[model samples]
Target: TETTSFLITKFSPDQQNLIFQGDGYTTKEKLTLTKAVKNTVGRALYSSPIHIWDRETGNVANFVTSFTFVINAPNSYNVADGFTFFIAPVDTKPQTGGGYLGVFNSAEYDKTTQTVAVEFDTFYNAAWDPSNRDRHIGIDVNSIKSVNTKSWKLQNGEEANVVIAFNAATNVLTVSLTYPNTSYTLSDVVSLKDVVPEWVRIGFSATTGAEYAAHEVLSWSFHSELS
Candidate 1:
């Protein structure tokens, strides 16, 4: 049978099974995911060890999640790093600071990690990115090199709604974004069973570099089934 669970509107850290780590994140009156610092580099990871789905089951249920967030760049409009919503077998910490986004490192890249993420990238990493544009949405499978990407039109200081869905029957993951009455989407075929365990953890992570911004998640909701 298919089952679903969800968290909507404002969320309470204490009432929910969540863990907040790193120096950059805080719960704002139990309603928001706020990064309070400015103009300095930082990293934060928020995760819950809840079992989302089961890969070993003969029939796995699809999953969907959505969140509303705002990226308020500094007065200068220079945003250094970005943020990501990811699922992994375990909560892993970034080996270094800045552009690592709190989930990956240069040494391991994406080759060894078991993660799938949707990234809202605000800055261009010259060594890894194919282009120099600073605003884009990318789908990452274990590595930072996005298999697919699209120019995200919303600029810094704007609010955006993001939706991510995984179709268990087709093994496709789709990501969509809406901002200022417009929408954009991207997707890829990735079998969750291939990279992660039957049970996994889901979370969000953000980072800042020389240039910085406050990344805030205003609300979140997730629904799925477990075998």
Candidate 2:
């Protein structure tokens, strides 16, 4: 059996075992996925690859992750972008652009891309969003467009608490979100065989366009096992 538990009550400025990319930074013991910047993206991921499945035994892994974040979009014009929790190919590179969320893009994305993402989208992009509504949570297989979506509400600059869990046996993914007075939970039965590989990296990604916001994660914890 392969088992692991990773926790970060708060990330230090010089935190180890993490790979920060693009605009990602550790400041004041908090991980700012992206500072307000136009057409830019950032990512913070576990440094090493984690085992997801066993080829010989045909066994998959299960995992659960929790985090709290705040999107302080004080821009008068708009709150441009959003963020995501992702399980991706170990060597996947970030794509910087509006709505890409640092995970997928027209230039680099492929049909064979190995990725699974849960997006907390705050912006309304006509091309990808299910509806014109801005505040939503969706599941992405390997593209910017979500496979399934659930709409929710969150006021600007408010803090959001989130939990994401995947059950290997049921091939189900559950996402739950909480605000001060409201909460929402949704689930999807996803086929991991087509979405990911035997080894992967897990992390968060955020981006901004003309209308920007400062996206930061205050705390995090992750536990997983492969049997």
Candidate 3:
């Protein structure tokens, strides 16, 4: 049997210090960002977040959000579940299994006030089902659903590497699902600049069904020089 491990790190709320996982394995650790930086306008807190001021002021934008996460399921697990990547205005800790879109739940950031995007949604719940887990993608502004994919299936819970990229300037967002042990394939792309807010928080969200499907993020990175 192959065992899995993970490492997490983050800057202090003051954005001046760094906190890292001691050495080997740690389950979940929550990091908070204070008002020192406009936590409101950023991208992918799960990975190293990029603050606009750092780039606009000639600071070496050297931060990147990259990590591996895993969710396991028992051999006899069942039911429905999923996860997502979010950019919201409400700065807070991570939540366990949120309704649809995970942290994108309207409670954290109102649909009338922020932006959100979700990937690999798998659920038969009354709120999102209507589509099943057919390789669909969703984009919401403030909390209201704006755009979604036609529905498609990409992979099973075996083991895979998936990535999402966005160009704030072109207003374009793309999702890629790959077999790290093999080749790469570009999955989906959507332009949502028109629906996402000007400034919002960015992070990842996920959940498992009765099977304890452990979802792991092997590596993640982002490039945003939005002007």
Best by lDDT: 2
Residue lDDT tens for model 3, 1-227: 11112233422223222222111112234231111111111122433333422223332222123333322333323423444555544343343342443444543335444444554554444444444534344554445233544353434444444555554434455554444344233323333343333333455555443322334343434444533
Error of 1 at 119 (Å): 0.2
How good is model 2 by TM-score?
0.94
**Clashing pairs in model 2?**
none
How accurate locally is residue 101 in candidate 3, as Cα lDDT from 0 to 100? 36
Candidate 1 per-residue C-alpha lDDT over 1-227 given as tens digits, one digit per residue, 9 for 90 to 100: 55556675765456344556565444653333235354333333334454555655655558888988778776545675777888776655553446656666652345567777788887778767547575789887777777788887656666788999989878889999998758989899987777665566777777777767777777778887654
- Among these predictions, the greatest TM-score belongs to 2
lDDT of 2 by residue, 49-119 (tens): 88888789988889999999888887744876899999888887786467878887742335666888899
Between candidates 1 and 2, the one scoring higher on lDDT is 2
State residue 200's C-alpha deviation in candidate 1, in Å: 0.9
Q: How well does each candidate superpose onto the true structure, as a TM-score?
A: 0.84, 0.94, 0.55
In candidate 2, how many Å is residue 6 off? 0.6
lDDT for position 79 in model 1: 75
Which whole-number lDDT from 0 to 100 does residue 48 have in model 1?
44
Q: Tell me the spans in candidate 2 whose CA falls farther than 4 Å from its real position.
A: 106-109
Model 1 ranges with Cα > 4 A deviation = 1-4, 13-16, 24-26, 29-59, 107-111
